[PDB]
Subunit: 295 residues, 4 copies
Amino acid sequence: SAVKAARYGKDNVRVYKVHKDEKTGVQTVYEMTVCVLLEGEIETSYTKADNSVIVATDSIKNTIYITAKQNPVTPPELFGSILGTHFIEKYNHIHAAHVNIVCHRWTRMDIDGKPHPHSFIRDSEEKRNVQVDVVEGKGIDIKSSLSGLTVLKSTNSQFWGFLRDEYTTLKETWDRILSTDVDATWQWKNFSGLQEVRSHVPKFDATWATAREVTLKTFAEDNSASVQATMYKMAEQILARQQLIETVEYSLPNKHYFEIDLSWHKGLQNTGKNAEVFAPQSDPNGLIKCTVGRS
Amino acid sequence: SAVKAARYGKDNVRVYKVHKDEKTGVQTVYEMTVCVLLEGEIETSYTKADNSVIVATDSIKNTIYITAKQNPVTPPELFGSILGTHFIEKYNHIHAAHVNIVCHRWTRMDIDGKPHPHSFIRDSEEKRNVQVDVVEGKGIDIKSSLSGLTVLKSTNSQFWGFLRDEYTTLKETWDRILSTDVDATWQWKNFSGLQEVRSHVPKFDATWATAREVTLKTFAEDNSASVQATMYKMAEQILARQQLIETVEYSLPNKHYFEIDLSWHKGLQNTGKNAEVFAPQSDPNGLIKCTVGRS
Amino acid sequence: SAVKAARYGKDNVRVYKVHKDEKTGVQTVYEMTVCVLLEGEIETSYTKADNSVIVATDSIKNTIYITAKQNPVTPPELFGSILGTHFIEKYNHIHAAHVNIVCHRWTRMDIDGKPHPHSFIRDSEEKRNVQVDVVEGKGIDIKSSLSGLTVLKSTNSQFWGFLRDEYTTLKETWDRILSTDVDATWQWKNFSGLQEVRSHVPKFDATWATAREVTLKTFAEDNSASVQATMYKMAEQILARQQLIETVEYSLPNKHYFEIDLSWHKGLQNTGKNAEVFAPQSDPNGLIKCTVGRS
Amino acid sequence: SAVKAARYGKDNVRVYKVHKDEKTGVQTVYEMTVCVLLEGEIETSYTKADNSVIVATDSIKNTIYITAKQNPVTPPELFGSILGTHFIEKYNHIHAAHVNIVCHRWTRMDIDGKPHPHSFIRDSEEKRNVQVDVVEGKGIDIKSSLSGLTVLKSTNSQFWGFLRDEYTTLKETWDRILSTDVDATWQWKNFSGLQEVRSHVPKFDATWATAREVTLKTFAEDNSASVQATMYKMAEQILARQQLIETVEYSLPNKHYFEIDLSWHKGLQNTGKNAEVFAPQSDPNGLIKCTVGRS
Ligand SMILES: O=c1[nH]c(=O)c2nn[nH]c2[nH]1
Ligand SMILES: O=c1[nH]c(=O)c2nn[nH]c2[nH]1
Ligand SMILES: O=c1[nH]c(=O)c2nn[nH]c2[nH]1
Ligand SMILES: O=c1[nH]c(=O)c2nn[nH]c2[nH]1
Ligand code: NA
Ligand code: NA
Ligand code: NA
Ligand code: NA
């Protein structure tokens, strides 16, 4: 037998950082969960019990805290690139670092119409994420994403004209509820190293904001022919607005809300044009994915 | 042996309702999870296999949908009271109904600075809940709550002057992070029946809004001496603003964020006044509760 | 305003203890999650910011570890009683302690047909729990439970003869699937104090084992007329076998498995006597509760 | 813009099947959660709103039930291969099907020392899974796995001799607790089609059993030098016992249990050789992965 692939590290490292502006008294908080996995010349730890090649996962944890102390943690694309580069530069036998960061929302509270200097609310479990792969001699690959953005529209969604055969019971419809949890990932062109990532720092927050805005507006405004058609429109717009993105991937559940026929009860009308009360379905769910790139 | 207590019904009934304004084209959605448990002269279903006394749980489910079709579902205090009253009036041998409702957030989207007519976002997993107990001959008892409101302040929290003995290692502090998930319940005076609940309908949404606003403002503005002291201030204000509330109960976890001593690494200073990076603790957590009523 | 009730403490304290037999080399592990909430003359911490009455929750955490170091942690009824008694005896102004313990399964592995001395498996998320309320001058109240015991029988369950009215669509049946997650609690007679709890130590594990065995056998063997009727039979037997139990409470979801009519597809027969493939329903679910005590 | 990749289908389809032996009266149940995603000439549904190429996800759901009605559902490798093959053969424009199956445990109850004919218990949340990729013209690729197997050993684990630098605080140890949740995947050689999968049917259950047995025995018996070294030993043995496996992948969290220094309290000794009470850590956790293949 032989080791074909190996990676190891520390997962679920929770980190909080506060920035305090001494002039204005305003404080800003960041909270993240970080995972770092390393690859390199470490096969002997598996095959020969040679621990000398192992940077202990506990040390990886310490490094994450030290790195957060000495560097900005925002945008996460930059922090991830700093953290990954550290491992490949510090350890001769480590040749790749894989850094995953999930950013949790702490939104400044408005109290009596004014932004509070040091109080925050978790407004939704929507996350902003990064995956950064730093590979010695091959640069830095970054995938940025938003996830856990849950939306619903109560009309202006249709689904008709699909294939009908002996396995089909679904009725065509010209008016249905559409609800999903949005998972959207944009993949940046490969960066040569940390200097290049630093040079594009302003684009990271701006592109996240654009991806979010395009997703919300397109969902709200499209008279949707299907999840497939609406999601493609979203991806097309993101690619048009940021030339440094190579691909956009969406993964969307179709969270179904079923009509309830109540006509058995005193002829109560609750279907088609008369539908008011619906039964949300926990499972099963449609799952629709697409990766859109450039011509 | 004898049956000392029994209740049964249907849990986890998901319900969605849409309201469509034909004039303006504006749609409004409501989504809830409902549980209804019944009590009454049903002991024989347990002791003698006498199913004749059982209103099937499936029928309870149907009733929830029918009731939502024929009545407003907001405020939830009213819907719960209608639903509970139905069971005690319809079935001679059912003498109490216990209705729990969890309301999920669907907040209207703003697209380009204007409210969208039919698109919604789940902004946080904060819930608005009701517990309604309808007991034949004893009226309607309603407990309203908010839950899952997660907040953090990065300064203006202290904790010193507590008991110190041979079990104590905790250092006194004059500046710490305070974070919690708020669970707040207000209990209404007993209502004689549905007519009285209807007469107070406007107070339900207003009191929820007040409870939320008082919670947020007090948390943000109090230079907190302890969770105990800050939570009491919240409860006192709610009772002062709504005379029809008898008690307010808060249940608050103290979600700890620990300093990380990095001084072992190149004398790095990250404690006390120099603390910037902290480790959020998933467990254990403090848990502090209080019920505040009138003199 | 006035404080009507208050309690506070530490939740989610994870504890592991190992016992090592030096003679045989056999090791035995215990893992628990513990919550301790205190009550007493602590109102001033809420109303006057008087922290002098507060035993810090951090100290409560330390006490749990120290107590586990110096005492047996099994049976949990005994450990809970020791832990609760500590607080009411040590602190003059603390008058009640409420201790909740969840015991996690670590079952010794059998390797090649023999019990391994120091290797364990988590066989299911079934828990054994205790709630112990120690109240100064009123003794020790203990409720023991098992929870998370998930079972299914594929036949020998019926449900017919229930009330039928204009809200009813459920068909009567003489053969259905019955599946539930068992939550069963037995409440002990009040104990005068720790000496009395110690005197009954052997009864705690034996009664847990009996409750489990009665639950499983009754479920498997009863040709069930309803959840109500089968659960009553379980409770009756437990009360008959342990005279020191005052009441038994069961709380049982009815986890539904629906027939799927496939007759639209080539006349495929999959209902009634021909039913082979079913759709498990995640929600809603029936919820049936009963508390059984002595004549 | 262009569609680079697309797949869509139905997720979270819960399925139960019962087998009834008329001769013996013995019933056997199977419960699974199934996901099927399709690929093929479907780009126009995304780019042109052309739904004619879409096999509706609802139809995919129906197909899963129909297929389970007409075929054995065990071993899951066979059922997955039947289900995937169906889609590529039935629809000219569908060229790949991706089938994921999670099998839930329903273990026959022993009542009074004998196997019960129709009563079952969920003994642990351990799962047996399959991923089957059926690609037109490229055969059938199957990855089989077990997951959610949670184990702990209280001694006979060591970790010393790792890299020490200015980021390291971890002490070397010759005796620690080792606990993990096992995720193990074995990848079969490519099969030419359904006939070949059928020819190997007996190997699927046998290899699952072997993988499980090797995992448990190796964990229990290895005086472990690291997670890396123990996991490699497991993978090596599986590859030796089944020649039709090409690779074995393990992904193992290192779930830490920390010593608690109690020496501040009356000189209590609870570290090193005296350690009895430990604090399980929910996070962070080590994560160690390896893929082992043939020379
Ligand atoms: O088994 C281990 N492997 C590792 O890589 C490691 N790092 N810290 N502790 C550890 N234990
Ligand atoms: O066992 C049952 N008890 C009930 O009360 C019920 N209601 N619907 N189905 C049911 N099954
Ligand atoms: O606000 C607090 N209240 C308490 O009771 C406590 N105990 N430890 N830390 C604490 N913080
Ligand atoms: O938008 C949809 N896309 C689909 O592929 C589908 N299949 N069923 N319903 C559906 N809705
Ligand atoms: Na390197
Ligand atoms: Na009545
Ligand atoms: Na006392
Ligand atoms: Na095909």
